[PDB]
């Protein structure tokens, strides 16, 4: 019909970009957590520097942040597998897999955890 | 300021020489390299609205390096306007007919920018299967290089 010339693989450059994006997302989360921790420290009664130093850093309480922190639910880039950085689970593909770059707004969308065996 | 001065030497066409016997670049790479020279992209005075490229003499083109089975299998094409008159010639066949020089030339042509200047640039490139050629005298040569 109408030619949408989009390849089934990604170029190395694309892959690298994807990786970078993933890393950035992780970093954002990390930063958020750090901020929360330092706020907690300040509330308790410490300085900024002191808070930064502290061995026992506080985990976040809010559900979403906690979930993000868990690597079971939301892996970090170094943890993540090759097969999940550049492919998603498609319920109706051959091999039940599909290049992430096919997913509508893949540059914004985050999607790490494919199914366990698929 | 910088552009002001005697600019005659900049836009002088140098003759370069490449001995394909003594060059280990494979065909395509070599062609690409030559293309740049032809265009004149190597010189800082280049501007796209100007043919300012140098001359390239290729010699010993018989010893050019081609990889894989391309000598046998790589097919050059030519079509008249007339349906059914598609000529498809293998690289080896072409070589037998015209020479390795032709091969090289084709590659260079492909490399070059597709505009008026193209043909001139292509013609600047002078290729010879063996060593001997009529340009031996005019290749650029320095006085300090004369130890040999």
């Amino acid at each position: 019909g109408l030619l949408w010339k989009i390849p089934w693989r990604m170029s190395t450059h694309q892959k690298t970009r994807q990786r970078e994006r993933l890393r950035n997302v992780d970093q954002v989360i990390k930063q958020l957590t750090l901020g929360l921790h330092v706020q907690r420290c300040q509330d308790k009664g410490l300085t900024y520097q002191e808070a930064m130093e502290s061995k026992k850093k506080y985990k976040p309480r809010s559900k979403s942040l906690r979930l993000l922190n868990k690597p079971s639910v939301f892996p970090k880039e170094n943890q993540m597998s090759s097969k999940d950085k550049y492919w998603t689970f498609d319920k109706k593909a051959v091999g039940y897999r599909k290049g992430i770059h096919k997913v509508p707004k893949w540059t914004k969308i985050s999607i790490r955890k494919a199914p366990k065996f698929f | 300021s910088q552009k002001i001065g005697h600019s005659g030497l900049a836009f002088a066409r140098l003759w370069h020489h490449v001995d394909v016997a003594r060059d280990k670049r494979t065909l395509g790479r070599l062609a690409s390299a030559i293309a740049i020279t032809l265009i004149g992209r190597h010189k800082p005075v280049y501007h796209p609205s100007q043919d300012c490229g140098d001359y390239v003499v290729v010699t010993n083109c018989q010893k050019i390096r081609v990889t894989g089975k391309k000598f046998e299998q790589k097919t050059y094409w030519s079509h008249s306007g007339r349906p059914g008159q598609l000529k498809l010639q293998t690289m080896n066949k072409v070589v037998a007919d015209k020479g390795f020089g032709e091969i090289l030339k084709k590659a260079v042509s492909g490399m070059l920018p597709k505009n008026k200047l193209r043909k001139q640039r292509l013609d600047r490139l002078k290729v010879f299967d063996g060593s001997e050629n009529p340009y031996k005298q005019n290749i650029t040569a320095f006085a300090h290089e004369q130890s040999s």
Binding site: - | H17, D19, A21, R22, T59, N60, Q62, K63, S80, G81, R82, P83, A96, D97, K98, G99, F128, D129, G130, S131, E132, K136, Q137, I139, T140, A141, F142, A143, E145, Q146, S148
Partner: protein, 249 residues
């Protein structure tokens, strides 16, 4: 007494190498070609008449080729010209008709201002004949076969029916105003043009024709004529060339 010359190291140290054999070289092409060994001669087609074989009593249409004043002018060699051939002249021509340059050329080669000059290409240096030497019909033997070149009669602008023997259309059964036309000249949009070499009306004749393996029937030095079996192309007084044939050598 030396001159200021330099030399690049890249070109000095470059080991000597011979360029291999190009097929599109003249030399190579020469080898390939299927050329005659001997030379030939220029002639004028005079007319046609019947030859009668006196033993079998059989009538053969024969065209008379007149060999007036045929002379080798000069020859061409592989070293200088890249092929082996002799330039033959035919017939005397009046100074007034000949260019100064051409007169000079003729003088160079001690011949009279010729009517028609033509090269005959040969195989090897052996085929050449000494220059300035005259040729007679006796250069050919009765019974031998020759290849003849001449320029066909011009038919002017011709239709497709005459050029290519097209069938035209029906004479009377509705057919209107197109009786001798060529019909379709292509297909629809999927060439969308007329292909090169489409047979179409146009000039016909006045072109070179080589007619091969004609038998020399007779050869009479006393009349300056050769007799050839059959029809030779072109009008009366057309210049013809005969070489010994290659297919039946």
């Amino acid at each position: 007494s030396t001159r200021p010359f330099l030399v690049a190291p890249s070109i000095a140290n470059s080991i000597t190498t011979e360029a291999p054999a190009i097929n599109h070289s003249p030399e190579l092409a020469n080898a390939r070609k299927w050329l005659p060994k001997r030379c030939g001669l220029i002639t004028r087609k005079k007319g046609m008449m019947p030859y009668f074989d006196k033993s079998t009593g059989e009538r053969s249409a024969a065209t008379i080729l007149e060999v007036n004043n045929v002379e080798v002018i000069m020859h061409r060699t592989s070293e200088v010209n890249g092929y082996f051939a002799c330039q033959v002249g035919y017939g005397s021509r009046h100074l007034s008709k000949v260019s100064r340059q051409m007169l000079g050329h003729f003088a160079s080669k001690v011949v009279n201002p010729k009517e028609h000059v033509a090269e005959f290409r040969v195989k090897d240096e052996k085929g050449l004949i000494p220059p300035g030497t005259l040729l007679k019909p006796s250069f050919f033997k009765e019974g031998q076969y020759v290849d003849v070149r001449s320029v066909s009669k011009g038919k002017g602008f011709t239709g497709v029916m005459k050029r290519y023997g097209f069938k035209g259309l029906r004479a009377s059964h509705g057919t209107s105003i197109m009786h001798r036309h060529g019909g379709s000249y292509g297909q629809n949009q999927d060439p969308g043009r007329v292909l090169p070499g489409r047979k179409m009306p146009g000039h016909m004749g006045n072109e070179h024709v080589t007619i091969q393996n004609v038998k020399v029937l007779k050869v009479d030095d006393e009349n300056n004529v050769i007799w050839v079996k059959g029809s030779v192309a072109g009008p009366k007084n057309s210049f013809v060339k005969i070489q010994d044939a290659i297919k039946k050598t």
